[PDB]
RNA sequence: GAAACUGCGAAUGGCUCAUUAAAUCAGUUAUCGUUUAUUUGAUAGUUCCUUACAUGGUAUAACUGUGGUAAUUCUAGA
RNA sequence: AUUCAUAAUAACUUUUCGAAUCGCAUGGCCUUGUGCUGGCGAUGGUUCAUUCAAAUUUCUGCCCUAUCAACUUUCGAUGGUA
């Protein structure tokens, strides 16, 4: 019995189950004034420039300090590439929450950025995502898990048709997530690779089915 | 009824005060617990903060330690023989403070029994003790002094009148009677 | 008067209205607390045995205990007593009651029945109506129904079959005072509270001095 | 039933004493239900697959259930009809109820009393509630001096009066008070009071006392004796948590040196009592059983620890006997060297218990040296405290004792200080000479 | 009154909070805390009138109901809370920390700081004492007891008090000579060195202080609060660094 | 989540100046002469000691029912 | 400045306190026992300190009146002892 007559008052207690419980991953299913599809100076910066009013964390301001030093236009990101993804992983990696969140909605917005030329970035960033993933499990934060899973959504949603083209190596990266011994991890990295599945057309669903048939005969012995 | 202020006196000069206002809680007094002599009856008076208080209306036993050898025991009170305020009480038998009670010897004279191997009456050094305390023991009672207040804590604790006030209170009684 | 009769075996009760003066007179110098007797009472009681348990007189004054004066009276009733409830904290207010000793004013008697008679009264003796609620310790349900102390208590919660509309539902209570891992585990944690901390202060206590005989070994 | 048979009894009294006496035997009557079981089979597969919507593994369960069944067809019949043939297994608390039945008919139990004496005589096992029932129907005893065996009766009474749970000491003071005669029908109310918990030590002081108003005369005094030790027994196993009992276990040992000589030494004969050393002087210094167990080590701390605080207020003048207080004293220091070296070091509760036990033990025989020395004869037992001196400790008596003055030290030193006391050193080798050495 | 009071007016406020005469009838009374009546700040004063960072006491209670504000490495959710001197007021998503510490002008001031110095908090040991089973302790002028102190410390001596663990890290004697901050009088907020205790037997001693443009005054020892040595603050003192002027 | 038990508050606030002429009050002191809910910081292994701690026992409210009275924030019996 | 803080001794007590309470979660163990252990925090409780207080309290300061010069003490007025 969850809480299904609401009362009278405003703030209720909701404790970190009942929070996971009610969370959902689709942002499609969500929709907002998108400021960082709304603006298009470069997406990037504007999400960049939203977060610095925002954001008052000592880690975000000195990597607001570093990147904005770097960045203030495209030529300027895809020419600086590489640095700012790798400060990017190094706070992501400094694991703090008040800092937590912008951070990964920059990593969105930089991949949507760099779009097809991400994907030699993209396996040490859902790298560095799990590992962020499974520390949020040490220390309990719905928010946490909403913003990370929301990042894994929208990396997907943008790298669409390179990773629907090579189906197989996304799953063989998050089946460390999706056999994890966690029912809310397993919900939600199931929730958004079923994003990607629902992307895939005939041909690589039959390859990345009968794969998927292998690893679990592989996992037998697993449950989860 | 009782109350404690100093609104209600002359004044130092020989003034007689107005009043001033209404009586107060925090100037309260309460009756005297006159007690007695009997089986063991004590109330329970609630004081300011939240504290108990003890009062004392009968009262049998008692704890009376004697001093020159620094040790204590519980007797029985026999009787009030002197009080230096008012011989109705030593008359009507309240015990208060500073009254001068007859004791049981028994359970003192069984200590010294057991402590010195020598009885009583009829370390050597260490088991001689005065003359006057001496007769009280072959008596069978012993004068001792209360110096508890048994209205308030509601025990009657006292010690042993050793040498120089037992002169004294010895002179008061032979001189009273 | 009017004579409020209760058989409390059955949790039964009804009333009877009583006009000669033959059997209230049988009634009369009585007290609450006393017996009398059905049959010189009337016929139908006939082998019956009441005690006098309360009244009212004619005016509404309800019968104290412990007043022995069959008049009314003014009495300066506390917290703890009958007749009288407390509107506020440390309260006494001084109210009209009636006494104890039964007289001719008395508008209702009413009476317990200790001892069955030999006939069937309609609304005492044949009816009953059932304990409204069960057991709500664990040890009351235990004891109800005669459970073994190795035996638990949730397969034997007394339920009750509620209806609104088609939906059937049943209702059961919450076992107040049953032995739960949460308690357990509760009690668990005083007991390393208590231990963690004495340790912590023999630490520092052993801290302190150590740095005093230092101090004094300088 | 309970209200009903009370009326009903007095037709035939004699089926329902038999019924309720079955129903006092039936809990420690055995049940057994064995009944023909068949060769095992190995009749078990999973049929269908195992899954994990809940509704679909129910009705899976069912269904493999029911295959389980025929499949194994044999057992399955012979559970089958065991559990449609019903339980006959009569629930644990039927002698409660018994017992309350019994407690409202006292005098059919009156009447007959030879089928309830074995249980009082084999001392139940029965619960604390039954026992306190039982106790209850025995003050409800009407003609009580005439029950089948009167005295034996009397002396479990006494000892269930001596227990230590002051509501058992209740109910035996009331049946000791059935049993009627005018000298506890003139001290009834004192030992009630006695009983009561808040006026126990202004009672004591009260008429305890000797040579006050109110205290027990001499006759009174002999025939009263057994109540007070046993009542004061039950306050001294009171166990010293706090303050309180503390003060009282003191008051009652503070009291005790009022009585009288033979009166103090039937106090501690119960205190021994309790105890065994029938075994050491039946033997020589041989135990019997090997009984090193926590219970037994537990009453010899509680008899040493009454016996220094008797000791302690009974500096002088209390009697030595030896069949009650130095041989179950030499008994306990040899049960404590006994444990220490027959069992390991892995019972740490045992070992620290026997530490504690030998402590005490040392501690004692030390302080009645020192409080009695010369003041009565030895020569009986000189042998058996020198042999409880000399197995384990003059062999390494310079090892242990060297930084205080110790117990057994100090017993040593008074044995050599005294002059008719040299006979323990005459009596070895000098070997306590040469351990001084 | 029969029993204790529990509103404070507007003009019955203590001065130096800076409350405008307007805005109302009452002024937040301050709970009872560590810090006594007429020298705390209480928290709806410092985030309303002081930081803006709220308009109402209902948005005073938000943030506080939302568990921002900690007080000395402690979570607080009383409004009225008595945030007195020297003390440590740390936002956490705001990234602050606030060392409340009085300005020349005689009020309170808002002191940005810095992790490693929020870390830590003076305290003018006031009290030392023998406690039950034979402990001694020291009081400091917020309540705090420190039990098993160093055995050098004395009344009126400064200890620096490392906050996570309610600990004694070091301390700083009253002699002629140190550092020595003013809190109470008309002076206070002056910071200056201490030239000469003048010291009386039942009365009250005063204290002789200069400061940095050897200026003198005179104080009482209740005023006086010694912050560290010559010109070696153990605190970051605010702007002015406590001076007065023309 | 009604009701009722329990906990806290109702001793603050608001109004008025009748009384009171070293009285109240103002400034200055003292408590080494006392009580203090609350807030805040510290604080309590006592191991054993002769014959249930996987956690003792009673009741009572509200409620069901029977009533009194011209009437009140009246209440009685079960 | 103390018979202070504190400690120790001997007893005393219609005698206190030393958690039979409550919310969220469910991790570590393994003798696979429904066994052992464990996080965050709510209420409470002995003493001591702190704070909001409270009660007493020291000095000095009140308008008109001498056609008001003696006043207070049985009935406490001033002090001493209990």
């Known amino acids: 019995q969850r809480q299904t007559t609401k009362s009278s008052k405003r703030y209720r207690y909701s404790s970190f189950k009942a929070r996971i419980d009610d969370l959902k991953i689709e942002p499609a299913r969500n929709l907002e004034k998108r400021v960082h599809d709304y603006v298009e100076s470069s997406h990037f910066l504007a999400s960049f420039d939203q977060w610095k009013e925002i954001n008052l964390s000592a880690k975000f301001t000195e990597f607001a300090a570093e990147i904005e030093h770097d960045v203030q236009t495209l030529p300027q990101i895809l020419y600086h590439d590489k640095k700012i993804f790798n400060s990017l992983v190094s706070f992501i990696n400094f694991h703090d929450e008040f800092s937590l969140q912008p951070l990964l909605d920059l990593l969105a917005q930089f991949c949507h950025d760099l779009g097809p030329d991400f994907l030699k970035f993209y396996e040490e960033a859902i790298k560095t995502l799990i590992n962020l993933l499974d520390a949020a499990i040490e220390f309990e934060s719905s928010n946490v898990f909403e913003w990370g899973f929301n990042c894994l959504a929208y990396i997907f949603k943008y790298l669409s048709k390179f990773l629907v083209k090579k189906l197989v190596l996304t799953c063989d990266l998050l089946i460390p997530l999706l056999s994890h011994s966690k029912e809310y991890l397993s919900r939600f990295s199931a929730e958004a690779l079923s994003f990607l599945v629902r992307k895939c057309p005939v041909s690589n669903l039959r390859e990345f089915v009968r794969s998927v048939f292998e690893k679990l005969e592989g996992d037998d012995e697993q449950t989860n | ?177 | 008067m009017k004579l409020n009769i209760s058989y409390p075996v059955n949790g039964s009760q009804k009333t009877f209205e009583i006009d000669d003066e033959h059997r209230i007179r049988v009634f009369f110098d009585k007290r609450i607390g006393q017996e009398v007797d059905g049959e010189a009472v009337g016929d139908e009681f006939k082998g019956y045995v009441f005690k006098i348990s309360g009244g009212n007189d004619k005016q509404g004054f309800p019968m104290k205990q412990g007043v022995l004066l069959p008049t009314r009276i003014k009495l300066l009733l506390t917290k703890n007593v009958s007749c009288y409830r407390p509107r506020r904290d440390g309260e006494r207010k001084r109210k009209s009651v009636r006494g104890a000793i039964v007289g001719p004013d008395l508008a209702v008697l009413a009476l317990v029945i200790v001892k069955k008679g030999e006939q069937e009264l309609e609304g005492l003796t044949d009816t009953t109506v059932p304990k409204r609620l069960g057991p709500k310790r664990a040890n009351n349900i235990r004891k109800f129904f005669g459970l073994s102390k190795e035996d638990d208590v949730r397969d034997f919660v007394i339920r009750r079959e509620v209806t609104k509309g088609e939906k059937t539902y049943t209702k059961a209570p919450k076992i107040q005072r049953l032995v739960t891992p949460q308690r357990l585990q509760r009690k668990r944690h005083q007991r390393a509270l208590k231990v963690r901390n004495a340790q912590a202060q023999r630490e520092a206590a052993a801290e302190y001095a150590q740095l005093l005989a230092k101090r004094l070994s300088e | 039933v309970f209200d009903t048979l009370p009326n009903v009894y007095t037709k035939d009294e004699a089926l329902v004493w038999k019924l309720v006496l079955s129903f006092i035997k039936l809990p420690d009557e055995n049940q057994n239900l064995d009944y023909y079981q068949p060769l095992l089979e190995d009749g078990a597969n999973k049929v269908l697959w195992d899954s994990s919507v809940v509704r679909l593994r129910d009705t899976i369960d069912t269904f493999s259930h029911i295959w389980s069944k025929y499949s194994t067809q044999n057992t399955s019949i012979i559970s089958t009809t065991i559990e449609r043939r019903g339980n006959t297994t009569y629930p644990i608390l039927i002698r409660n109820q018994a017992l309350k039945v019994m407690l409202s008919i006292p005098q059919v139990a009156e009447n007959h009393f030879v089928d309830i004496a074995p249980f009082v005589y084999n001392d139940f096992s029965w619960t604390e509630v039954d026992r306190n029932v039982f106790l209850k129907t025995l003050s409800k005893f009407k003609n009580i001096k005439n029950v089948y065996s009167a005295t034996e009766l009397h002396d479990h009474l006494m000892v269930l009066l001596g227990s230590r749970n002051t509501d058992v000491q209740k109910l035996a003071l009331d049946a000791l008070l059935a049993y009627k005669n005018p000298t506890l029908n003139k001290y009834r109310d004192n030992l009630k009071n006695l009983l009561d918990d808040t006026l126990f030590k202004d009672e004591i002081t009260t008429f305890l006392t000797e040579n006050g108003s109110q205290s027990i005369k001499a006759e009174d005094e002999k025939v009263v004796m057994p109540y007070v030790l046993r009542i004061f027994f039950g306050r001294a196993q009171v166990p010293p948590t706090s303050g309180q009992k503390r003060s009282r276990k003191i008051a009652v040992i503070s009291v005790l040196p009022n009585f009288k000589k033979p009166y103090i030494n039937d106090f501690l004969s119960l205190a021994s009592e309790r105890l065994d050393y029938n075994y050491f002087f039946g033997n020589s210094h041989q135990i019997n059983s090997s009984k090193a167990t926590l219970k037994t080590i537990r009453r010899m701390t509680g008899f040493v620890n009454i016996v220094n605080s008797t000791l302690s207020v009974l500096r002088t003048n209390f009697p030595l006997h030896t069949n009650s207080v130095l041989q179950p004293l030499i008994y306990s220091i040899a049960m404590a060297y006994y444990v220490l070296d027959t069992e390991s070091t892995e019972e740490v509760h045992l070992r620290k218990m026997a530490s504690n036990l030998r402590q005490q033990g040392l501690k004692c025989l030390s302080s009645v040296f020192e409080f009695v020395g010369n003041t009565f004869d030895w020569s009986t037992s000189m042998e058996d405290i020198y042999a409880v001196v000399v197995k384990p400790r003059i062999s390494h008596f310079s090892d242990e004792n060297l930084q205080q003055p110790s117990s057994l030290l100090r017993l040593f030193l008074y044995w050599a200080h005294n002059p008719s006391l040299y006979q323990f050193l005459y009596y070895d080798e000098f070997a306590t000479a040469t351990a001084l050495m | 009154a029969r029993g204790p009071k529990k509103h404070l007016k507007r003009l019955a406020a203590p001065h130096h909070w800076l409350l405008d005469k307007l805005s109302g009838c009452y002024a937040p009374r301050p709970s009872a805390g560590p810090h006594k009546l007429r020298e705390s700040l209480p928290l709806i004063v410092f985030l309303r009138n002081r930081l803006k960072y709220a308009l109402n006491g209902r948005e005073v209670k938000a943030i506080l109901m939302q568990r921002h504000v900690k007080v000395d490495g402690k979570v607080r959710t009383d409004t009225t809370y008595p945030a007195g001197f020297m003390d440590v007021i740390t936002l956490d998503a705001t990234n602050e920390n606030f060392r409340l510490v009085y300005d020349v002008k005689g009020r309170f001031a808002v002191h940005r700081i810095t992790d490693e110095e929020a870390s830590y908090k003076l305290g003018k040991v006031k009290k030392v004492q023998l406690g039950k089973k034979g402990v001694p302790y020291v009081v400091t002028h917020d309540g705090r007891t420190i039990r098993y102190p160093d055995p050098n410390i004395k009344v009126n001596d400064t200890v620096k008090i490392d906050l996570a663990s309610g600990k004694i890290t070091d301390f700083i004697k009253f002699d002629a000579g140190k550092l020595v901050y003013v809190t109470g009088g008309r002076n206070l907020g002056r910071i200056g060195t201490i030239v000469h205790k003048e010291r009386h037997d039942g009365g009250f001693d005063l204290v002789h202080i200069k400061d940095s443009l050897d200026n003198t005054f005179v104080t009482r020892l209740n005023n006086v609060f010694v912050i560290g040595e010559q010109g070696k603050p153990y605190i970051s003192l605010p702007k002015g660094k406590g001076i007065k002027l023309s």
Do not use: M
Request: glycine share 10%; charged share 30%; aromatic share 8%.
């Open chain 2, 1 to 177: 009824g009782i109350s404690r202020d100093s609104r209600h006196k002359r004044s130092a000069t020989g003034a007689k005060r107005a009043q001033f206002r209404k009586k107060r809680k925090f100037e309260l007094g309460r009756q005297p617990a006159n007690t007695k002599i009997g089986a063991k009856r004590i109330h329970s008076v609630r004081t300011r903060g939240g504290n108990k208080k003890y009062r004392a209306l009968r009262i049998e036993t008692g704890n009376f330690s004697w001093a020159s050898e620094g040790i204590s025991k519980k007797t029985r009170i026999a009787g009030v023989v002197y009080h230096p305020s008012n011989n109705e009480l030593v008359r009507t038998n309240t015990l208060t403070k500073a009254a001068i009670v007859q004791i049981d010897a028994t359970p003192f004279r069984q200590w010294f029994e057991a402590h010195y191997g020598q009885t009583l009456g009829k370390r050597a050094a260490s088991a001689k003790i005065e003359s006057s305390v001496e007769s009280q023991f072959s008596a069978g009672r012993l004068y001792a002094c209360i110096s508890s207040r048994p209205g308030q804590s509601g025990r009657c604790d006292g010690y042993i009148l050793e040498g120089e006030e037992l002169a004294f209170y010895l002179r008061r009684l032979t001189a009273k009677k």
